[PDB]
Design an enzyme around this catalytic site. Sequence first.
Site, mmCIF file in Angstrom:
data_model
loop_
_atom_site.group_PDB
_atom_site.id
_atom_site.type_symbol
_atom_site.label_atom_id
_atom_site.label_comp_id
_atom_site.label_asym_id
_atom_site.label_seq_id
_atom_site.Cartn_x
_atom_site.Cartn_y
_atom_site.Cartn_z
ATOM 1 N N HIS A 1 0.808 -1.223 0.000
ATOM 2 C CA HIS A 1 0.000 0.000 0.000
ATOM 3 C C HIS A 1 0.847 1.282 0.000
ATOM 4 O O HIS A 1 0.282 2.364 -0.183
ATOM 5 C CB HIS A 1 -1.079 0.038 1.088
ATOM 6 C CG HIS A 1 -0.578 0.189 2.493
ATOM 7 N ND1 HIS A 1 -0.061 1.385 2.951
ATOM 8 C CD2 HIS A 1 -0.650 -0.679 3.526
ATOM 9 C CE1 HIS A 1 0.209 1.194 4.237
ATOM 10 N NE2 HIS A 1 -0.129 -0.033 4.625
ATOM 11 N N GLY B 1 2.036 5.935 10.163
ATOM 12 C CA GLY B 1 3.399 5.729 9.695
ATOM 13 C C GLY B 1 4.099 4.520 10.288
ATOM 14 O O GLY B 1 5.273 4.283 9.991
ATOM 15 N N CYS C 1 3.268 1.479 9.620
ATOM 16 C CA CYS C 1 3.233 0.383 8.628
ATOM 17 C C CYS C 1 4.623 -0.064 8.219
ATOM 18 O O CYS C 1 5.565 0.739 8.208
ATOM 19 C CB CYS C 1 2.361 0.712 7.420
ATOM 20 S SG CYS C 1 0.870 1.658 7.811
HETATM 21 C C1 LIG Z 1 -4.316 0.193 3.044
HETATM 22 C C2 LIG Z 1 -4.549 1.703 3.238
HETATM 23 C C3 LIG Z 1 -6.065 1.951 3.229
HETATM 24 C C4 LIG Z 1 -3.935 2.434 2.038
HETATM 25 C C5 LIG Z 1 -3.941 2.246 4.540
HETATM 26 C C6 LIG Z 1 -4.097 3.591 4.859
HETATM 27 C C7 LIG Z 1 -3.508 4.136 5.986
HETATM 28 C C8 LIG Z 1 -2.765 3.332 6.846
HETATM 29 N N1 LIG Z 1 -2.239 3.875 8.071
HETATM 30 C C9 LIG Z 1 -1.056 4.532 8.162
HETATM 31 O O1 LIG Z 1 -0.702 5.123 9.167
HETATM 32 C C10 LIG Z 1 -0.146 4.632 6.976
HETATM 33 C C11 LIG Z 1 1.137 5.061 7.030
HETATM 34 C C12 LIG Z 1 1.615 5.102 5.692
HETATM 35 C C13 LIG Z 1 0.619 4.699 4.920
HETATM 36 O O2 LIG Z 1 -0.496 4.395 5.678
HETATM 37 C C14 LIG Z 1 -3.142 3.906 9.249
HETATM 38 C C15 LIG Z 1 -4.475 3.172 9.028
HETATM 39 O O3 LIG Z 1 -4.530 1.949 9.051
HETATM 40 N N2 LIG Z 1 -5.537 3.959 8.860
HETATM 41 C C16 LIG Z 1 -6.868 3.414 8.622
HETATM 42 C C17 LIG Z 1 -6.956 2.717 7.263
HETATM 43 C C18 LIG Z 1 -8.205 1.881 7.103
HETATM 44 C C19 LIG Z 1 -9.380 2.436 6.610
HETATM 45 C C20 LIG Z 1 -10.531 1.670 6.488
HETATM 46 C C21 LIG Z 1 -10.528 0.334 6.856
HETATM 47 C C22 LIG Z 1 -9.360 -0.189 7.342
HETATM 48 F F1 LIG Z 1 -9.355 -1.482 7.757
HETATM 49 C C23 LIG Z 1 -8.201 0.538 7.467
HETATM 50 C C24 LIG Z 1 -2.473 3.453 10.537
HETATM 51 C C25 LIG Z 1 -2.709 4.125 11.726
HETATM 52 C C26 LIG Z 1 -2.310 3.573 12.930
HETATM 53 C C27 LIG Z 1 -1.666 2.351 12.907
HETATM 54 N N3 LIG Z 1 -1.402 1.682 11.779
HETATM 55 C C28 LIG Z 1 -1.793 2.244 10.626
HETATM 56 C C29 LIG Z 1 -2.607 1.981 6.543
HETATM 57 C C30 LIG Z 1 -3.193 1.448 5.405
#
Ligand SMILES: CC(C)(C)c1ccc(N(C(=O)c2ccco2)[C@@H](C(=O)NCCc2cccc(F)c2)c2cccnc2)cc1
EC number: 3.4.19.12
Lengths: 302, 305
Positions: free
Chosen positions: A41, A143, A145
Amino acid sequence: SGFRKMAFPSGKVEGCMVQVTCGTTTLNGLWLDDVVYCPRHVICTSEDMLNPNYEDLLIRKSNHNFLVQAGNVQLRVIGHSMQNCVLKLKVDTANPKTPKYKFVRIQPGQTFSVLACYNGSPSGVYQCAMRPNFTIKGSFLNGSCGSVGFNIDYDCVSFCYMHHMELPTGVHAGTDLEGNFYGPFVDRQTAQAAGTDTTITVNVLAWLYAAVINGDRWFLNRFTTTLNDFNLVAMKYNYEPLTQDHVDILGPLSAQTGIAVLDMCASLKELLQNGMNGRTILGSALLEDEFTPFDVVRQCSG
Amino acid sequence: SGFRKMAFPSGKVEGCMVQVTCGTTTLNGLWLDDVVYCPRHVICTSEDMLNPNYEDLLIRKSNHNFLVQAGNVQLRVIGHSMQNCVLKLKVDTANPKTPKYKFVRIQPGQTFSVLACYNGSPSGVYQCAMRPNFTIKGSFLNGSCGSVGFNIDYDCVSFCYMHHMELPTGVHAGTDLEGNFYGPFVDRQTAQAAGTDTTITVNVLAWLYAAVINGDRWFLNRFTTTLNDFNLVAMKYNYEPLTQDHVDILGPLSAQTGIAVLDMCASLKELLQNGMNGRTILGSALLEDEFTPFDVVRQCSGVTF
Ligand SMILES: CC(C)(C)c1ccc(N(C(=O)c2ccco2)[C@@H](C(=O)NCCc2cccc(F)c2)c2cccnc2)cc1
Ligand SMILES: CC(C)(C)c1ccc(N(C(=O)c2ccco2)[C@@H](C(=O)NCCc2cccc(F)c2)c2cccnc2)cc1
Ligand SMILES: [Cl-]
């Protein structure tokens, strides 16, 4: 003596963490030999997180679209491929700090250490378990991830988890290091929910054996139970079914303490019925389920 | 989201762990520059344990009586001296993995990460706090002596603890890296007991702020209290007194969550007097006191090392 939630020393994994940037997105990568593994992603656009076509998004990327930073040095990307939900960036330098390692996919109930990272830099280490609903109750911010879960039995690092996302309930979802998600989750912004979570029964029994090894016997009783009567009671408290495999696995701890597995199951049944009545077991007022039978033996016996 | 008991990354400390053997005794040493630090009790035999004269036992040792192993390489001991309850073995090789470091003595309530080691090999890392009674509720087996506690403040490792022994109740006692024990303990086999322990009030408040940051608000209430009325309640429940310094330290968390420190004290007072009523806070049915205000800010903001 003592019983703590204990993580593996993280040094071997710290030397593998790098920052991976693709456009406006930055996350963590795991650099082993000449490959940097990270969530696919990282190539996803802000305009469409709902239905990304990763094959289509990746074919448009050139090697110079991936900026990999290891400490203060920029690594040169010389190839890229996707395996399931993980992106593998071939780099021109093998990591000189690559430990002896393996990729292992774990089952629910299994524990592992997580090295939480931001911008390719380790910030902390904690211990957790793969929940029966295939989520992990981690501590992760934006961030995080690409941060990984691992075990280090002997001098070999077995990587079992790579963090991908946070579900609406605050719990976390990720993949093994082959990019296969744990649980029915997908790497896209779509309505996804963690299924009802349950207690890891075999781990609670392991932790009760740890309490007996550390001198806590107050919860023991003169009763035993059949495996089926235990499971009938267990399910009513949202405990996972205890299988004959779990009974066999608890054998060594049973032999060490002199308490039969079904005898300990009767203690667990009584604890579920009565609560702790102001008492604690190993410094906890709840029944702990993130210590496996293997963790208990490792921490108590060495 | 999420809040875990989190230790600092241990890599910088792992590169300093060595095995120290003196006669039949083996324990861990900390190799920084050309010195290996370890508990002075490594020079004790079975009879010596009851009433050892460390000056007399040490004067009888030659450099070759100390076998120091760093990985699979034997380090050469070229000198030895004692500072309080720590033995300092001068070696012929400076540790090339010596991180930027300092020795700091911590106060009760302060937390630190412990890298538990056996035979100079790291086996696990856990986070704990120096209890108000100067013990640590650690997890240590035979041969864990010499394992160290540390914090990382920016790029510098601050070593604050070296493991020495286990008390009869299963809790642990050790020294700072200058060999001064935390607590009224001595390094000999004699009747020693941990005093009655108390709860680290400022840390419980910090953890309640962490719970609010993570969406747990059930324990909040409309009330506030004075610092004196809170301390009168806190003393009744074996909690440490809350000082104006503690209130000031909780300032940033108070401003972030909108809960004044005395407003959070009123939540804590009600929890002490009434319990949790079947409810949990951050997955716990007890009030957790091993997260400092700094730990909470660090974890809820993702500071890296
Ligand atoms: C796959 C996608 C949608 C592109 C994704 C988007 C963002 C991220 N997060 C990021 O921080 C991140 C850093 C760089 C890129 O993304 C979040 C995060 O997960 N947010 C919410 C996503 C979301 C929405 C709707 C149903 C879901 F199941 C998940 C996060 C927060 C706290 C801890 N870990 C992860 C991971 C994945
Ligand atoms: C200072 C003396 C008495 C020579 C000492 C002797 C042994 C150790 N232990 C060792 O494992 C060890 C490894 C190498 C040498 O000793 C024990 C241990 O403490 N045992 C009990 C001693 C004892 C008696 C009486 C009041 C005490 F407070 C302690 C231990 C177990 C678990 C975890 N940590 C420490 C430490 C100190
Ligand atoms: Cl597994």
